[PDB]
Design an enzyme around this catalytic site. Structure first.
Site, PDB file in Angstrom:
ATOM      1  N   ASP A  90      -0.340  10.128   8.794  1.00 54.79           N
ATOM      2  CA  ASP A  90       0.800  10.956   8.377  1.00 54.79           C
ATOM      3  C   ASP A  90       0.688  11.236   6.882  1.00 54.79           C
ATOM      4  OD1 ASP A  90       4.411  10.690   8.493  1.00 54.79           O
ATOM      5  OD2 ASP A  90       3.183  11.988   9.767  1.00 54.79           O
TER       6      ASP A  90
ATOM      7  N   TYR B 219       1.999  11.559   3.020  1.00 55.56           N
ATOM      8  CA  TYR B 219       3.088  10.930   2.266  1.00 55.56           C
ATOM      9  C   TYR B 219       4.353  11.772   2.408  1.00 55.56           C
ATOM     10  CZ  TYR B 219      -0.351   8.123  -0.406  1.00 55.56           C
ATOM     11  OH  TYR B 219      -1.325   7.246  -0.806  1.00 55.56           O
TER      12      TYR B 219
ATOM     13  N   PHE C  80      -4.192  10.017   1.556  1.00 52.97           N
ATOM     14  CA  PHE C  80      -4.032   8.935   0.571  1.00 52.97           C
ATOM     15  C   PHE C  80      -3.938   9.353  -0.884  1.00 52.97           C
ATOM     16  CE2 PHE C  80      -4.040   5.688   3.662  1.00 52.97           C
ATOM     17  CZ  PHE C  80      -5.003   6.008   4.596  1.00 52.97           C
TER      18      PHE C  80
ATOM     19  N   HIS D 204      -5.551  -0.796   8.520  1.00 54.80           N
ATOM     20  CA  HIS D 204      -4.971   0.197   7.601  1.00 54.80           C
ATOM     21  C   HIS D 204      -4.723  -0.455   6.225  1.00 54.80           C
ATOM     22  CE1 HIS D 204      -2.157   3.255   5.986  1.00 54.80           C
ATOM     23  NE2 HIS D 204      -2.668   4.073   6.890  1.00 54.80           N
TER      24      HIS D 204
HETATM   25  O1  LIG Z   1      -2.576   1.881  12.933  1.00 61.01           O
HETATM   26  C1  LIG Z   1      -2.407   0.813  12.406  1.00 61.01           C
HETATM   27  O2  LIG Z   1      -3.067  -0.358  12.794  1.00 61.01           O
HETATM   28  C2  LIG Z   1      -1.463   0.634  11.247  1.00 61.01           C
HETATM   29  C3  LIG Z   1      -0.997  -0.694  11.074  1.00 61.01           C
HETATM   30  C4  LIG Z   1      -0.116  -0.999  10.032  1.00 61.01           C
HETATM   31  C5  LIG Z   1       0.278   0.031   9.176  1.00 61.01           C
HETATM   32  C6  LIG Z   1      -0.183   1.336   9.358  1.00 61.01           C
HETATM   33  C7  LIG Z   1       0.369   2.276   8.312  1.00 61.01           C
HETATM   34  N1  LIG Z   1       1.472   2.857   7.850  1.00 61.01           N
HETATM   35  O3  LIG Z   1       1.541   3.722   6.749  1.00 61.01           O
HETATM   36  C8  LIG Z   1       2.521   3.315   5.831  1.00 61.01           C
HETATM   37  C9  LIG Z   1       3.183   4.546   5.290  1.00 61.01           C
HETATM   38  C10 LIG Z   1       2.438   4.984   4.011  1.00 61.01           C
HETATM   39  N2  LIG Z   1       1.389   5.963   4.287  1.00 61.01           N
HETATM   40  C11 LIG Z   1       0.257   6.206   3.365  1.00 61.01           C
HETATM   41  C12 LIG Z   1      -0.637   7.346   3.905  1.00 61.01           C
HETATM   42  C13 LIG Z   1      -1.109   6.961   5.182  1.00 61.01           C
HETATM   43  C14 LIG Z   1      -1.899   7.952   5.728  1.00 61.01           C
HETATM   44  O4  LIG Z   1      -2.393   7.699   6.917  1.00 61.01           O
HETATM   45  N3  LIG Z   1      -2.248   9.124   5.203  1.00 61.01           N
HETATM   46  C15 LIG Z   1      -1.751   9.443   3.959  1.00 61.01           C
HETATM   47  O5  LIG Z   1      -2.055  10.551   3.483  1.00 61.01           O
HETATM   48  N4  LIG Z   1      -0.929   8.556   3.278  1.00 61.01           N
HETATM   49  C16 LIG Z   1      -1.058   1.700  10.379  1.00 61.01           C
END
Ligand SMILES: O=C(O)c1cccc(/C=N/OCCCNCc2cc(=O)[nH]c(=O)[nH]2)c1
Ligand code: NA
Length: 223
Positions: free
Chosen positions: A64, A66, A77, A187
């Site tokens: 996703d 930000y 990211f 992640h």
């Molecule tokens: O699939 C999994 O195993 C997994 C497990 C734990 C956390 C997450 C992640 N959550 O994201 C936290 C929200 C902050 N997002 C930063 C970011 C993520 C991303 O995929 N792309 C981006 O552009 N920016 C994914």
């Protein structure tokens, strides 16, 4: 500027007339009339603007964009100056500092320097409503970014795919492991970072694999 890089458009435009894609365009346009949607329109496809599609060497798959003000700009990211690196990006930089001896925190979060070297920074979902994580999930982006991954799978060779966390792992399940290299770990989010990401050494590993593919390595410090 153009909305969508020419070399990518040539190979992906077969998606554009498909019902799901027209529907997706309609959905995003309607959302933009009633909500703040990130990234802004001219940055949704930044990942097509930084290098020619033929020059891709590494693919980092995110989920996703930000969802905070000024953060998302179309590269997973990454955050443009003067925005501070969010926690996931601080963790990526921390891993780089231990993995690559010469790497030091560059003092900003803009990953364009990697994108220009052929590191495709692709999120599965390319828009999000402000302050609402995953709000545009399952609206058609997944099918489109699946088509991107599939095109690269079938039309290039020896890429390194970096799959961090379960969603990216699912999205890369069909990558031809006879034709391309795949590395997988947790992640880089704080909640998951110590479940594999710290110590994964994906950046040095990527460069060794690129050498096996007969390709020049990424300078991870070139930011
Ligand atoms: O699939 C999994 O195993 C997994 C497990 C734990 C956390 C997450 C992640 N959550 O994201 C936290 C929200 C902050 N997002 C930063 C970011 C993520 C991303 O995929 N792309 C981006 O552009 N920016 C994914
Ligand atoms: Na509308």
């Amino acid at each position: 500027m153009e909305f969508f890089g020419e070399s990518w458009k040539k190979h992906l435009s077969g998606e554009f007339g498909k019902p799901y894609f027209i529907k997706l365009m309609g959905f995003v346009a309607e959302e933009r009339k009633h909500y703040t949607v990130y990234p802004p329109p001219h940055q949704v496809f930044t990942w097509t603007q930084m290098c020619d599609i033929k020059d891709v060497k590494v693919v980092i798959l995110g989920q996703d964009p930000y969802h905070g003000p000024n953060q998302a700009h179309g590269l997973c990211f990454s955050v443009q100056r003067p925005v501070p690196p969010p926690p996931s990006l601080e963790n990526i930089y921390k891993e780089l500092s231990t993995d690559i001896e010469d790497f030091v925190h560059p003092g900003h979060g803009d990953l364009s320097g990697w994108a220009k070297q052929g590191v495709l920074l692709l999120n599965a979902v390319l828009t999000v409503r402000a302050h609402q994580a995953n709000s545009h999930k399952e609206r058609g982006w997944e099918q489109f970014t699946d088509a991107v991954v599939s095109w690269l799978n079938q039309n290039s060779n020896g890429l390194v795919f970096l799959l961090w966390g379960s969603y990216a792992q699912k999205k890369g399940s069909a990558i031809d492991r006879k034709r391309h290299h795949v590395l997988q770990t947790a992640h880089p989010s704080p909640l998951s970072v110590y479940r594999g990401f710290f110590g994964c050494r994906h950046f040095s590993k990527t460069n060794e694999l690129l050498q096996k593919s007969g390709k020049k390595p990424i300078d991870w410090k070139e930011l």
